[PDB]
Amino acid sequence: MMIRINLLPVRAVKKREMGRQVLVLFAVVLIGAGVANYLWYDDRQSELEAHQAGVAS
Amino acid sequence: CEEPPAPAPPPAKPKAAAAVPVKAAPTETGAQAAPSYSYVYNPVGKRDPFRSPI
Secondary structure: OOOOOOOOOOHHHHHHHHHHHHHHHHHHHHHHHHHHHHHHHHHHHHHHHHHHHHHHO | OOOOOOOOOOOOHHHHHHHOOOOOOOOOOOOOOOOOOOOOOOOOOOOOOOOOOO
């Protein structure tokens, strides 16, 4: 008797794979944009400290 | 630190370099004076003396 299993090939395979890659790209872009939002936050806190020094003046 | 000029908004010296200009002090100090001057003087003279004695 022949026991066959067409489970995980291929438009299922490569569409789960494309599904993975698109999401990895999403993750990378969102981590980068995150880092940007950060570095911005730091320049802003520095500016705030300079300005509070001025207000003390 | 702050650079040649600083960054650009300008930053912050808005507030440092206005709540400075300067220390102020400020010398509530070292005046001088016009003073003031008095006025002079009441007569016409009278005779008894000295007409007879010269």
